[PDB]
Symmetry: D2
Subunit: 246 residues, 4 copies
């Protein structure tokens, strides 16, 4: 593939319906050696399952709870023992306590929900870039992450999560800003949604939802040297929805 | 003036020549009855004295550090003994741990520094929108806050305060979708700075703006003159934001 | 008022309830003395009559088809006979021929219709900017124009005119950049829809649950050309009650 | 390559150092059958040479002034006598009268300059979509145009092209939502310069190459980007994201 020879870490594979899971799949098709992290022992089995069919193996799977600094550093110590270097890190972690994500925004949003949603979904990505700066030394690789339109504009019940996404995408630009002198490109892919999920379909220009695959392909490219003049981008894979108003 | 009749709470007055002091002035020029909070006990005497010259009294000054829900709540419960309603809350509290705003971003940014920056400089706004929802009921008021170009494009050492602001700025949009129904508008004012001579030559107006200028806009935004504007981020920077080079 | 002592020219007054008039009314109400252009010979009587309720007189009205560079300066040649200098230009004219603004974009959009939509809606701004540069010198004044959300995101039956506003909006920035040196501020107001079935959804979405009024879009527009807003140039002020910020 | 199977009409090829060229090389490399236009009678043979070096031949080269409606017409007519379907149209022609790109924006900008600036740099796209609608129909194709930061922000001596470009970018958006239902995707690459002080600030601390813009340009018109429409993708090292 066009990603042959590169070696990527992949954070937050939790399912195969996931958006993470479309990316890993397309990233193997394109020739990448992969690794995976799983948040907890519950999901440890199914990550390793998926991993094995994605060109990877149980021994390239590590426990990581991105709320923890050490555990992230631990991931980069152990992985660093199978590969002489890392090229790509992928970030697919979206988490805010549900009571923040259903009701009147102003009403339900608590300080602690704000703290968490931001920590898990925004800064984890800076820590990942931090905790792996060394292993991406002189690889000219890249970092990726996932965002949503709700960081640029408002929608029902997405609520405080749009504040996290807005910060992430900022964090993306500042990451591009600093990490780039050593040749790291930081980018993010903003995907469309995967009754009213059909009111989306008929305003989205392509009259259809994007597939976890198309986001994979698009997130694959952004990590390949096909995308090597491209940094600080937020790429929208949403059938063109954001370009609509009425 | 164009604000007479309106009452306004001002959070985060800390110096005579801050953008917040510019706002505070104009809103008084325009007749707003002003109330103030103070960050801690050192600044107390400073804030009371400013308040007194902006038509208010120390009676209308209350202790608040926006890192604590409980003190915040005591603000509106203390004010509510003085006012049977409130029109405006002006949110000019911008802060992050110093070491994060000095160096390479990836290197100097910390979990705890992140969490603080975002707490004080962003969530505090929503905590004020909440804690003051009742006092603002049925008055069709407004909330103003301060952001900066750092939320939208990068620039030296602003670092994590560029994520904070972007989170703020999204909260503007969201608080707007929410409180709009009831008739509260929510807006922000993104000011220019006040060798930074590079900025100036590039800035279309060839100068910087002044807290005066940032305050008239601040004021306008919170006055009935604005009543058709909400969810908006008004750039008071002489055009600098619109230039690429 | 706060425009007191300021002089403005106002282009585009064609109805009594246009955004053009909302501005003109506002701007008078805050002290600015005004001048007006009529698009052609049919609107002269309307425009003049309006102008008198706005402190202006028949004499302060001028003919001008913004498709004509020569008429564009005829305004300023003639105006500078009553006024040694000018402070504001308000630019409020939206027109693409009707067949362009109806149906499927790609099908009904034609080269000429495109040409017109951009020459009227967009270049003309730059031309009032040009033509009146001399009279605005020294006054630390401002130009103001009107845009729409269509330019930045799509909405049915706006078609080519969103292309002509994105051009315009870009134009605002270039003018603001060019003329800032000598003091001229250049900004825009970008109103949401105005009242009189498809519009009822617009207001369920917009944060303030109501459309704006020309009294709102005019105050914004007034303010933006007043020394109160002297720190503001290159800006596109949204007046739509927050519509532009919502997606569902 | 990921464009294998695809056929593509490229508008704008005129120089070795073209952006237009960078896309064609990267596109052909990715396995597309290309086909080109040449503005005047000069540059005719020069297009042809490049064309014959890109797997094409001088019979898939057609005369076209994007200013004249009838030629663009005649382009797709003739092309449909060699080709069954069309998959990609690429639009890489920028031209404003030179005087307009030299001096004070207000002062040098004239109406005629405006007109040409917009007709060439922006209407041409629409017309290419328009006049080549039928050959794309059925195909789930894609269009691609070129833009620049001057639409989004100001800079010296770009002047009216920032206006042309801004329009074009809406034109991307309006097209995309018009031709989406039938499968046509519509995007743009906003490519940086291929300036010395520019370089200092862009994040990668370097300028982009026509191979870097051409790749992404190719990617977007390929089925690997079928979930993308209406975009202004930025290949400039992240310069847009910097203040």
């Amino acid at each position: 593939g066009f990603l042959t020879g590169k070696r990527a870490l992949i954070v937050g594979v939790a399912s195969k319906l996931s958006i993470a899971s479309g990316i890993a799949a397309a990233m193997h098709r394109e020739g990448a050696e992969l690794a995976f992290t799983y948040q907890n022992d519950k999901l440890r089995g199914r990550v390793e399952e998926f991993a094995s069919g994605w060109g990877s193996r149980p021994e390239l799977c590590f426990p990581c709870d991105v709320a923890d600094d050490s555990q992230i550093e631990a991931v980069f110590a152990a992985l660093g023992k199978h590969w002489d270097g890392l090229d790509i890190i992928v970030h697919s972690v979206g988490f805010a306590p549900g009571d923040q994500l259903d009701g009147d925004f102003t009403a339900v949003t608590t300080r602690e929900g704000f703290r968490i949603a931001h920590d898990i979904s925004a800064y984890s990505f800076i820590a990942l870039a931090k905790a792996g700066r060394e292993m991406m030394k002189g690889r000219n690789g890249s970092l990726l992450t996932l965002s949503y339109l709700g960081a640029e504009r408002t929608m029902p019940n997405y609520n405080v999560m749009g504040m996290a996404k807005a910060s992430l995408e900022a964090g993306v630009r500042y990451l591009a800003g600093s990490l780039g002198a050593e040749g790291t490109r930081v980018n993010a892919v903003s995907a469309g949604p995967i009754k009213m999920l059909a009111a989306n379909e008929r305003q989205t220009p392509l009259r259809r939802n994007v597939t976890i695959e198309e986001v994979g392909n698009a997130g694959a490219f952004l990590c390949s040297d096909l995308a090597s003049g491209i940094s600080g981008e937020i790429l929208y894979v949403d059938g063109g929805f954001n370009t609509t108003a009425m």
